[PDB]
Design a binder for this molecule. Structure first.
Ligand SMILES: [Mg+2]
Ligand code: NA
Ligand code: NA
Lengths: 212, 212
């Protein structure tokens, strides 16, 4: 399938582009500036080798995709979603977004509503799927690294959720787990500030989570 | 050291009594009636063998302990803490409590403030340590059970937190991880409803968590 990584110029986008393209999916890296996206797409192809990774302006990436992943920072996510609303409203949109703040006492969940539900409202969409929030980006973007992580997935539409879970299952090392309706997204998103706190107070590097 | 398991007649209390007693700690199983606590302790002693597991009224167990673990359901936990306030405010109190609501769309975190912070407020104590919320009770009570679980620990008093972390570290199969001040307890307590959702929507048995 075709997967657009909106703002996919960071490590999560890089990891998804490299791993999914190697599996045969057509990846489109999106960025505010087309030149930036094409440049990063070129970079990923060199690492990945002979695979389909192309770069486009976010609007064109969204237009061309089946699934759009919002790899943009939370701080600019609502504005980006709003601008792409008409295009994204009919696509499956995956939100790995988390409202988290750093503070003197550690990391906190900084919203009264979840990022995924806010995005669903801004998009007026029934196809938003919350997933991929707890994937250690640097480790994920390193193709020599092996891992065993679980990926909780939330969403109101059974079909969209099933498609996204199937896609995640194709990546060796990731196990998707259904966490229910989008109303449970706050519980999934909260794992990020919890993990950042564990990293901070125990002097540990990036971590994923496993339920067993 | 001495550990009081208040309302420790359930599986979490069972698992803790057996494992800590076998490690050489003096365990006091607490209950409303002295005679019923005594019977539960006897049942545990027969499983554990030559170990120190004694039964007492909750009030007496708390008074005799160094650490008191609130192994009671959330429903009447605050009333229980309040009743034992004068005794507990001077001891290290461990809270594995989680405010959870069960509805049509899954499980949700049902409090604005965390259970641990509410307990500290009622007790007017700085020695509350939040820990052990994500230990599958029935599995933990079975000594032949294989598991590798991490246990996030929150608390404002470093000495008290260190004591509790050292205690948990002694139990094979558990690894305590510092999650910061008590203000991060909501993030830790939130793992329970998340796991209950994962269990419900994937048809899984009780699970613990591991960071890796
Ligand atoms: Mg040993
Ligand atoms: Na997989
Ligand atoms: Na241990």
């Amino acid at each position: 399938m075709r997967v657009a990584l909106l703002g996919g110029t960071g490590n999560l986008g890089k990891g998804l582009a490299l791993r999914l393209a190697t599996l045969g999916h057509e990846i489109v890296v999106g960025s505010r500036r087309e030149e930036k996206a094409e440049a990063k797409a070129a970079e990923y192809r060199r690492i990945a080798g002979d695979a389909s990774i192309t770069g486009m302006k976010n609007e064109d990436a969204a237009e061309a995709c089946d699934i759009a992943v919002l790899t943009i920072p939370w701080e600019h996510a609502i504005d980006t979603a709003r601008d792409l609303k008409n295009i994204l409203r009919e696509k499956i949109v995956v939100s790995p977004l988390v409202p988290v703040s750093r503070g003197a006492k550690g990391f906190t969940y900084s919203s009264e509503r979840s990022a995924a539900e806010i995005v669903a409202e801004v998009l007026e969409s029934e196809k938003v799927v919350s997933a991929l929030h707890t994937i250690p980006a640097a480790r994920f973007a390193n193709l020599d690294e092996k891992f065993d992580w679980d990926v909780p997935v939330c969403g109101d539409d059974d079909e969209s959720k099933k498609v996204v879970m199937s896609l995640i299952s194709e990546i060796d090392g990731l196990r998707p787990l259904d966490a229910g309706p989008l109303s449970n997204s706050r519980l999934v998103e909260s794992l990020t500030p919890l993990i950042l706190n564990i990293m901070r107070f125990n002097g540990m590097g990036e971590l994923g989570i496993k339920f067993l």
